[PDB]
Amino acid sequence: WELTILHTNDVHSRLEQTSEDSSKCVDASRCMGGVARLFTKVQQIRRAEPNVLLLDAGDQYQGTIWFTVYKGAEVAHFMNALRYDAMALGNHEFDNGVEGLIEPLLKEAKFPILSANIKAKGPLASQISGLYLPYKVLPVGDEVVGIVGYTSKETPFLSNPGTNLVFEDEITALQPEVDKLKTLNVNKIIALGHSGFEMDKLIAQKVRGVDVVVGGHSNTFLYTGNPPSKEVPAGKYPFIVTSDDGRKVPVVQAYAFGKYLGYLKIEFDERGNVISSHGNPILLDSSIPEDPSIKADINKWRIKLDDYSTQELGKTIVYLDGSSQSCRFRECNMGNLICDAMINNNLRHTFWNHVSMCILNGGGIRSPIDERNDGTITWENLAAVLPFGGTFDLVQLKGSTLKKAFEHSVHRYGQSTGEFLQVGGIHVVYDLSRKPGDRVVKLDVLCTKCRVPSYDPLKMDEVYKVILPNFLANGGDGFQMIKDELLRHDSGDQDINVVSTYISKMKVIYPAVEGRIKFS
Amino acid sequence: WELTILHTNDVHSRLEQTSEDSSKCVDASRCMGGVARLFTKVQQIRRAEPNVLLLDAGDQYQGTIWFTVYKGAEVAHFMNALRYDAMALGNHEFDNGVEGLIEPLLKEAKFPILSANIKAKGPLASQISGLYLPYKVLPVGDEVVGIVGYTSKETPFLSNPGTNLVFEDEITALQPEVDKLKTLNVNKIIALGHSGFEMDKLIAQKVRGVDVVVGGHSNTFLYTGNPPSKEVPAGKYPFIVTSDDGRKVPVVQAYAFGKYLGYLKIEFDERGNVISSHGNPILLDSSIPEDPSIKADINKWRIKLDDYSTQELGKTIVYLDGSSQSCRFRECNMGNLICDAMINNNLRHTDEMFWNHVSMCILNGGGIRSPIDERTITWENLAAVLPFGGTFDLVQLKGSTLKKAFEHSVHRYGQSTGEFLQVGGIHVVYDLSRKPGDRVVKLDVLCTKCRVPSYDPLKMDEVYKVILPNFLANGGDGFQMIKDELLRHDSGDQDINVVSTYISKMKVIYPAVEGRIKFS
Numbered sequence A: 001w002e003l004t005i006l007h008t009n010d011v012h013s014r015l016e017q018t019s020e021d022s023s024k025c026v027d028a029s030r031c032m033g034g035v036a037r038l039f040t041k042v043q044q045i046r047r048a049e050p051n052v053l054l055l056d057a058g059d060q061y062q063g064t065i066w067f068t069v070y071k072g073a074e075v076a077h078f079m080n081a082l083r084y085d086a087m088a089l090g091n092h093e094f095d096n097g098v099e100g101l102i103e104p105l106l107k108e109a110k111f112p113i114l115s116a117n118i119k120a121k122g123p124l125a126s127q128i129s130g131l132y133l134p135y136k137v138l139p140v141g142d143e144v145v146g147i148v149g150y151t152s153k154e155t156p157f158l159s160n161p162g163t164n165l166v167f168e169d170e171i172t173a174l175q176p177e178v179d180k181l182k183t184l185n186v187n188k189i190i191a192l193g194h195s196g197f198e199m200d201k202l203i204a205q206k207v208r209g210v211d212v213v214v215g216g217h218s219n220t221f222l223y224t225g226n227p228p229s230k231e232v233p234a235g236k237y238p239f240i241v242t243s244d245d246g247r248k249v250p251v252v253q254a255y256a257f258g259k260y261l262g263y264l265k266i267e268f269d270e271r272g273n274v275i276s277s278h279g280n281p282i283l284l285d286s287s288i289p290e291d292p293s294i295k296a297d298i299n300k301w302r303i304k305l306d307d308y309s310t311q312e313l314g315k316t317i318v319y320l321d322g323s324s325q326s327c328r329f330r331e332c333n334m335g336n337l338i339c340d341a342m343i344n345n346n347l348r349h350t351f352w353n354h355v356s357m358c359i360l361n362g363g364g365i366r367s368p369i370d371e372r373n374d375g376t377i378t379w380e381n382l383a384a385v386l387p388f389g390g391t392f393d394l395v396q397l398k399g400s401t402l403k404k405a406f407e408h409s410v411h412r413y414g415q416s417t418g419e420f421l422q423v424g425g426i427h428v429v430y431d432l433s434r435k436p437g438d439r440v441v442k443l444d445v446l447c448t449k450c451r452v453p454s455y456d457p458l459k460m461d462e463v464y465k466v467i468l469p470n471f472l473a474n475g476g477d478g479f480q481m482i483k484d485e486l487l488r489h490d491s492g493d494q495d496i497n498v499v500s501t502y503i504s505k506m507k508v509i510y511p512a513v514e515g516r517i518k519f520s
Numbered sequence B: 001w002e003l004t005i006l007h008t009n010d011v012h013s014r015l016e017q018t019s020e021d022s023s024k025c026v027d028a029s030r031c032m033g034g035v036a037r038l039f040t041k042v043q044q045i046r047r048a049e050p051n052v053l054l055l056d057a058g059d060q061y062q063g064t065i066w067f068t069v070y071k072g073a074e075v076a077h078f079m080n081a082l083r084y085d086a087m088a089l090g091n092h093e094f095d096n097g098v099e100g101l102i103e104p105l106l107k108e109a110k111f112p113i114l115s116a117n118i119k120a121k122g123p124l125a126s127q128i129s130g131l132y133l134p135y136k137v138l139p140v141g142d143e144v145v146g147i148v149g150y151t152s153k154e155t156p157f158l159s160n161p162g163t164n165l166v167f168e169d170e171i172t173a174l175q176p177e178v179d180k181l182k183t184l185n186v187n188k189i190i191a192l193g194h195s196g197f198e199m200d201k202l203i204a205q206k207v208r209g210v211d212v213v214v215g216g217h218s219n220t221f222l223y224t225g226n227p228p229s230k231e232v233p234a235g236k237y238p239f240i241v242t243s244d245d246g247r248k249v250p251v252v253q254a255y256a257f258g259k260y261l262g263y264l265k266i267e268f269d270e271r272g273n274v275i276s277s278h279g280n281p282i283l284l285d286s287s288i289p290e291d292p293s294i295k296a297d298i299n300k301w302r303i304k305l306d307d308y309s310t311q312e313l314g315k316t317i318v319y320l321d322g323s324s325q326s327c328r329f330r331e332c333n334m335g336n337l338i339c340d341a342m343i344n345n346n347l348r349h350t351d352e353m354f355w356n357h358v359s360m361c362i363l364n365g366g367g368i369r370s371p372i373d374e375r376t377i378t379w380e381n382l383a384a385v386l387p388f389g390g391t392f393d394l395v396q397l398k399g400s401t402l403k404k405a406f407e408h409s410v411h412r413y414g415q416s417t418g419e420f421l422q423v424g425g426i427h428v429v430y431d432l433s434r435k436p437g438d439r440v441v442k443l444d445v446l447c448t449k450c451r452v453p454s455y456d457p458l459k460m461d462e463v464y465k466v467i468l469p470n471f472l473a474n475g476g477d478g479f480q481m482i483k484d485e486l487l488r489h490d491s492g493d494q495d496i497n498v499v500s501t502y503i504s505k506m507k508v509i510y511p512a513v514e515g516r517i518k519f520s
């Protein structure tokens, strides 16, 4: 009995087909992804394979003006259209609180939305009861397949789930649910959740009874063979984990932004043991046509969004690289633009200026902006780069705290983690061959108590004013040292307004990669 | 017989009283220098001393909006008013060619303008004949004093003297002219010229018959005792050189910008032998009042400058370092500002293969003639930074030509030479421990045929477009390889206009030293 699993994760409001960098589609002849194109491939596989399951491993929320306007009603509508078989809750599904999850998604989804390690308490327990389930038994042909859900344990730190939701250990909470499925003589069990590739591998190893793990959160790209686009594989597809009880357990993930459709075929035996498994994510490129019914429906929702593009804020003559593969691994000119804007909004009278430095987590830059659209930069383009609606605050940090933040910036370098810092008024050099915690070899900063601004070595006993996102001021992305050691905090202007005012002032921008970040 | 010599040098259009940094006078109670104040002190000394000579050692041309506008007619007018007894030609008296020297100055000066080592040839020899002289015999009391002139031998590389003027050795060309004076039984001879303190010391040593040397060009400050202002003496005043024939020969110089008045008393005997000499430059500070006749005449020439040169273009919150000690030895933020303006003026859409058609800039540090203090930016403040009225041209250069230009930039590093290049869109690293001609160790340039601008190693076989002053495009400052090897030359907008339009767009500027020029 062969099962075909189709899976998506971290789609992030990429409902319309996108460019190859996951930004707004301009040259439609080379655009990719989108629900319309996804519908075609999904309906293609359903007519070829008898047993098909379409799953989503979380983080459909947040990413473009689609979620800004419809706040999740677009997710429920178009996930229903594609006839998804199950969904796991991600951390971003809570960005608008529990109420932002219950009303638009949990109450309007025609498919089960799962999470086994989320426990509701107090007044919410009655309201959110049964709107999400720890597992679901799905009939597939004349067989049944069990799907247990899990959501990041650290979700209270990543989103806004509230005080009345308890997020338990994934493994601790999954084992009882898998055992209850086995008492129901469900011998085929998929672990579908949103905790990251590293937690997916522990669930495959530690949780007895899970045959497959379908994950997300880490934007992991797995491929066996020659990859078809720019994403570099982090491992074979499927990534095989050997469990504690000796069974080979495939672990899968399909990058992000709906660019690929995960595709895995499992051959089970009569008792639900995995005989073999093979597959590879399917690049949803121009060769696959967009479904016209889904596309027409998309275009009827699109005109409510078109008022976020009428005004031109300015022009860019260069590609504004806001891609994770860039801003999370090295200096990206999108980060330099934002940090240049943050410092420019903070031009006050004290020496030469009160602030000279800026830091910005690469994980806070959520999209690039294309320059082939006549160079036009609209509020919409910016809305996808800075979709959270946070502020760019002013902070005071001892040099010691700043060095610790930059050590953290690359303490686990290589995993596309979002704590890699883009900077302004700072020249940092890393030596990755050195130990974690000892990788910053040079850290020069732009002086304030000086008549001519120049770069001087950071001194740990000194105190520096830095402009950073409020998300970092609150210890987000693991920067707890900023929250615990900062000596002063003042709240600033909205992020997208700071970047928008600057673009309007400069009229034409051309930020470059200048060497603010170097590697030894 | 005691002679009192009053001497000025490298005034550079400092006709009006200035701040203590020789910039625009703002707080008039604390201003210094100026022609009016000089007239008072010179008159005071002539009313006290019997034998007085007022001499200038060159470089009255070029420095402020006074010369940019009046092109030397202000020099002739007020040098006559002050009753200068002689002037030596400097290298900057040729910045506007011979025509720019003959028309306003040589043609309107009521005093002798001297230079013994400038020889005219071919068609010019008759045209400029007698308009400048190798020597002059002047009555001083009931005695007669001879004055031989000399001009920097390297003036063809520093200015625009043309092809029909030969600059001979000061010593080689001076010895016959001094021999000419003693056969006329003139036993008192002053060597008044513009070649630098180091050459002045050779003329005192090598040319027999010279009793005193009055120099310029090196802005050398000499003082005996505690100096009265910020300038640090480079030696006693007078600096005594022992000639090859055993005579003690005083050498004098008086800084620059009309801040000081040189003052030297020489006691001769009946045979023209120097018995002794003493003195010290007189600081022309608020304590000396401005002469009312020269001052009123100054205010009547000011009306052509104040009605067009007093507009505010913008603000700077940082000190704009255009000082020679910085811009000729290391990256200086005034140079970065100018190059950033040059690049911003050349931001035209040419082809869809470029972020912009040109990305790079080079600028001879010796072309940056003043700083701007941040303690309002007007067209006049800028006029002192860029007083030549040149253009910022676009040139095509093979990488080899660019590498040779950057090798030349530091081939004689350490003598405050003006060929040291300020850059934009270029990251150059020098290793001065290496041989001259092999000191550039890294030379990265900003890409043009690229969607995201980034720095890549310079290719000697490729061709790059560079924006540079017209002075460099024509082989000035020894940049022969640029003129000889450039593959294309187009004239651009005026220097001060480009730097001015840029400041107006930015409203507030704050250039920094970013690492464009580094030393290994």
Ligand SMILES: CN(Cc1ccccc1)c1nc(Cl)nc2c1ncn2CCCCCOP(=O)(O)CP(=O)(O)O
Pocket (backbone or CB within 6 Å): A010, A059, A091, A092, A095, A158, A159, A217, A218, A363, A364, A388, A389, A390, A391, A416, A417, A418, A469, A470, A471, A474, A476
């Ligand atoms: C909604 N808001 C406002 C606010 C105000 C005050 C305090 C906290 C928040 C937010 N503002 C900002 Cl500025 N960053 C936020 C954020 N809410 C979340 N973040 C971080 C996401 C970065 C990526 C993490 O991980 P990642 O990108 O590696 C994986 P995932 O696929 O996203 O799970």
Ligand SMILES: CN(Cc1ccccc1)c1nc(Cl)nc2c1ncn2CCCCCOP(=O)(O)CP(=O)(O)O
Pocket (backbone or CB within 6 Å): B010, B059, B091, B092, B095, B158, B159, B160, B216, B217, B218, B219, B366, B367, B388, B389, B390, B416, B417, B418, B469, B470, B471, B472, B474, B476
């Ligand atoms: C008006 N024009 C156009 C042009 C074109 C072709 C030929 C001559 C002029 C000029 N444009 C520019 Cl861009 N630089 C100029 C310049 N004319 C002269 N320069 C260089 C000055 C170097 C100074 C060395 O001397 P220095 O700075 O070491 C100290 P001193 O003041 O001599 O004591």
Ligand SMILES: [Cl-]
Pocket (backbone or CB within 6 Å): B039, B042, B043, B046, B081, B082, B083
């Ligand atoms: Cl007089």
Ligand SMILES: [Zn+2]
Pocket (backbone or CB within 6 Å): A059, A090, A091, A092, A194, A216, A217, A218
């Ligand atoms: Zn997530």
Ligand SMILES: [Zn+2]
Pocket (backbone or CB within 6 Å): B010, B012, B059, B217
């Ligand atoms: Zn001079």
Ligand SMILES: [Zn+2]
Pocket (backbone or CB within 6 Å): B059, B090, B091, B092, B194, B217
């Ligand atoms: Zn000179």
